[PDB]
Design a protein around this ligand. Structure first.
Ligand SMILES: Nc1ncnc2c1ccn2[C@@H]1O[C@H](CO)[C@@H](O)[C@H]1O
Ligand SMILES: Nc1ncnc2c1ccn2[C@@H]1O[C@H](CO)[C@@H](O)[C@H]1O
Ligand SMILES: Nc1ncnc2c1ccn2[C@@H]1O[C@H](CO)[C@@H](O)[C@H]1O
Ligand SMILES: Nc1ncnc2c1ccn2[C@@H]1O[C@H](CO)[C@@H](O)[C@H]1O
Ligand SMILES: Nc1ncnc2c1ccn2[C@@H]1O[C@H](CO)[C@@H](O)[C@H]1O
Ligand SMILES: Nc1ncnc2c1ccn2[C@@H]1O[C@H](CO)[C@@H](O)[C@H]1O
Lengths: 237, 233, 231, 237, 231, 233
């Protein structure tokens, strides 16, 4: 049992999918895993462990923001023997050709957080995913006949940014989606020696329209889940 | 109304207490509020509204971290007409004279996030609470016969800090407690013109029983609710 | 004796009022203190000690800028046993409804100085006053029939800022008045463990009505807050 | 003709390999390309264009440092129609299990340069390579039976760093090699809309021994070149 | 008249010597100038104007800290037609062979102030003196049989630095002396287009031998450098 | 001896002129030096050593950029006993009174690289030239009857700046010329205890014939070589 996770070594698989929303986690456990067993609930952060095609998998929420998922990802890696982390979240689009429900794979993640600067002597640490994991996810996609753009995400500390001019900068450098934890998860993965990948579904467009919470914890967003789960199986081989 | 709260203008009071744990919010509503009804739960972030001694009040969790509590408090201010935000959580102590179970009141909050530099042209913004609100809590604490420290809190971005060095720094400049959102909430308050205050009970020390721990948590909440009554006058 | 204060332990009271102008420390000693006696003159920075309603108090200027007030404040706290520092000065207002002559208590002080980042490992240190001192000042003003504003101040390093766009930012976050030392004094107070407070009278929006009035009111507010503090 | 390149549209291929050393470039043109024709020499920065198995390719040096290769890569992209840039350089190893002549592929590149901060409003821009290009290079390697680690590189402004404690930080976050321009090339690629990849051969070990300039412009360092050239052909398909 | 200088165009010479100590501006007017006349007293910051070997010159203190000297310097340049500013002060030495009483001309000034970054879009602005003024000062000292050291200075914002490890860094890069304003003055000079120079006498390694000597020597060096400048 | 210079202690003079272009170094050696022999070329970075009016002197290119000239100048100081480094290049002008072909002397150099903050604990280090060296060049320029401006240079990391805004800033604070290495070389000089100076001729302006351009380049070099003679005394 860690400060935020009441579980023991073994309750979790070596691989756990992590959405920011705990209710999406329950939905994942219920819709895709077999013999799903709840292993955590300390602050409502639901944790589940079951099997997808024989493969033992776990799925748990990490909350919103980099300092939130940093806590969870860290405890999972250091105290529950977890090896790979695949964040299954949502994000806002800034590029004109990016559509809602489009799946994005972040091989990299920019950020306006100071976390990585704190652990890299105020320099620029490129927050990147695990190449193979990224590739497992690309292959999985092609095999499921689902589209997916591979690129940089931007992990923001402020959902409601006081600086909108930064979206022109993001767009210029073509960041695929705006979310809030990828860059923190990668930094943690690296700091504690683990492997991770962030997959996201465009839930809204910074320049246009959006979805609903309901749609966000159950509708589609099944594509990224299928992709995530299948890519894991690819990694097993 | 918003993607993180499925309530509508009128569902929340103009004063909202905010613990980090969604489960603690249900606990507060259940323990101190009468005729309380759940007003939200889109991400498990339970929110409630009821009345404390005839006063309409709300209680909702903000999750761990500045980025998280920034989304909720911001939405509460601009979308649900909330005027005051009172965070009620816990913190770790760094100074020796500060003991377990102490009720700390953050008049100001230092932080290691770039959130406020981003909104303050990279300069130093002093994230402070609302004066009267701090005072209402101090007075309310005296009435409940419970002494309370007032000072600086440190809002950390990393609960598991790689830079263990900051603790000696924090102690050097005498920050009372260490938590993870005071500076974030104060920043929102300043930006959208609202009032906020965060009270904490010392849960640990860098250097007691549950019945005693739980008694102090309830005191913090009583001080919170009672301060709101004082300000009403 | 210290590099900038030619005096010995005991010469200063545990409480010191500090105007920016050295010429005003003398005025205060003559106008409000009793049995005053000069205790410093090192650089024309006149310091005095006397009593107010029996309470021992000292007065001495700190000069303009954080670096300046920082030298004096530190030396007083670490070498003259001083425990409280009340800065009494002026400031410019940026907000639409903060008027000339108003009184503002700086509960906190924003700054463009790199002084606290150097102290706080380049992190955000909330330079704040001592709450009790804030409340005392607030209570002192109410008794004097004055309505003080309690909020944030902006301690600027450049009186003549290269960019005036920052004044909008300041309004946006409701800073009450623009001055040049509050954040420096608070920084020193936190570093050497002592209590500090800054009270300012709006002298412009970025005579008798000033002196025998507002300025005098602010000094009365300060001195009376000390007594309340002693309670 | 650009300020630093005396050539015209067409003299260069859409793909050009770029080592920091102009003499290594001549060596590449001479050893691997056919009908090699010199297209530049303004400040000794030799430029060559020929063919590798029918494919028209160019190879030119970019000098040492981020501000140097920034000039060249920029002019190439904006004035000579270049689309893909593959840096073929050398680097120092900081990890104990990294050996001289080991080939490294940088999917990411950390840096202590301020360049990306200047173009990203003082935030953290993840300097990453083009995924497909990275994968072309991985596949090429497996096909040539050559080993290659994929990861983060660190682009340094100071070869002789006044801060050696930063190597512990680099090593901790497992950066594969220390070089001096990857992060600048990626930033330019993104700022001007082009695709790029950085391949490096460990020329020395920060904690141990090193090679010679001669070995650096001709010996081995053929592996990365073969990998680079072949991966391009893969990308053509 | 300006916020901190109660005078009108014409009251100051196009050249102004500036000690940190206001009390020393008066000493210089009496000891070296001729037909001096007070031109300011706003905050005890005494300013004087007279002539040296027929050359019109003014003397006035700037106070401690960059913020301080920055207010005066700017007002002099933009409102009183001043074209040259020579700072004459003291500093502490960190280098092993820079001795007490030595004279150092700051060709450049390092700083921990955020003042120029605010001016230079957070980039590195080389706060430098006017070369001619440096050379004039250097030539002036040689004639006076004095061997001045020309190099870098470090303008510190905190007299009492929270970390003393920086003093090693300073030695490593050979800074000649530690003071508190040179980089601020240079910044203002560059911003409003004017020439500035800082001359310091080593007063410590971080009496008659000081006054009627070193301090007097430095003032002689300064005044004579002006005349050479006029050539 | 080193991975960027294949010479040995004795191959270089204690004073080295450094243009950015390796080809320009060969041009200087060929045009002003007698009995000059090539002392290096590992990356095409030609280096030469000969004598100017009986004085032993070297000329070697440093490539474009601070990171590049930092490697060479550093190696020259610590590995080949070099005492003085005199960069001789070109720059762009930003101020109107500064005309094409002006010979600028950088007494100081502003920069936008983190190189010096890295070595100066993130504080402001004033990258300046050696005083006497600046003076020797000023005197030598008068003798050659050529006026010369002395002031600040700006060492840019990005020749193609995305932030076009800096030019007005540079002009505001009156920096004479814009190049790419002065601050880098000065930083090395300070760090390894050596002396350096960079002279530039204005090649362009942000707002003439080759024979005239080439005449001014030679003047710069003559001023460089002649300044070295003055200092020798
Ligand atoms: N437009 C946006 N800006 C910022 N974050 C966004 C979006 C859209 C989705 N998310 C992600 O969902 C949570 C906050 O809504 C966060 O956990 C975040 O990853
Ligand atoms: N010692 C500590 N360091 C950091 N955060 C701490 C503590 C102690 C309590 N908290 C609070 O609890 C939540 C994260 O555990 C956070 O919401 C935070 O307020
Ligand atoms: N409008 C303003 N901007 C900046 N400082 C101001 C004002 C008004 C008053 N002060 C105070 O006076 C000194 C500098 O003039 C400073 O010490 C400061 O306390
Ligand atoms: N140990 C090291 N530290 C820094 N750069 C290194 C090495 C080793 C090789 N390189 C690369 O080669 C050039 C400088 O030697 C540069 O262009 C650089 O990419
Ligand atoms: N050792 C030191 N450290 C810092 N400042 C010093 C010295 C020595 C002299 N000064 C000068 O005196 C004023 C501050 O004491 C400042 O204005 C400064 O010019
Ligand atoms: N306008 C400019 N901006 C930047 N660098 C410039 C110029 C003009 C000349 N230089 C110098 O030439 C080289 C890069 O072209 C560099 O080595 C540099 O010294």
């Amino acid at each position: 049992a860690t400060p935020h996770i009441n579980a023991e070594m073994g309750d979790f698989a070596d691989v756990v999918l992590m959405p920011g929303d705990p209710l999406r986690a329950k939905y994942i456990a219920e819709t895709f895993l077999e013999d799903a067993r709840e292993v955590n609930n300390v602050r409502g952060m639901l944790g589940f462990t079951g099997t997808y095609k024989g493969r033992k998998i776990s799925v748990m929420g990490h909350g919103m923001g980099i300092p939130s998922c940093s806590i969870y990802t860290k405890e999972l890696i250091t105290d529950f023997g977890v090896k790979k982390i695949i964040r299954v979240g949502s994000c806002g689009a800034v590029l004109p050709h990016v559509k809602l429900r489009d799946v994005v794979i972040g091989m990299g993640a920019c950020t306006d957080s100071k976390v990585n600067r704190i652990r890299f002597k105020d320099h620029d640490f490129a927050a990147i995913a695990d190449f193979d994991m990224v590739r497992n996810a690309v292959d999985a996609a092609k095999a499921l006949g689902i589209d997916a753009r591979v690129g940089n995400l931007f992990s923001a500390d402020l959902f409601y940014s006081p600086d909108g001019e930064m979206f022109d900068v993001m767009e210029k450098y073509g960041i695929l989606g705006v979310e809030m934890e990828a860059a923190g998860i990668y930094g943690v993965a690296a700091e504690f020696g683990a492997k991770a990948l962030t997959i996201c579904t465009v839930s809204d467009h910074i320049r246009t329209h959006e979805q609903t919470t309901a749609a966000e914890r159950q509708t589609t967003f099944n594509d990224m889940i299928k992709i995530a789960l299948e890519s894991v199986l690819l990694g097993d081989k």
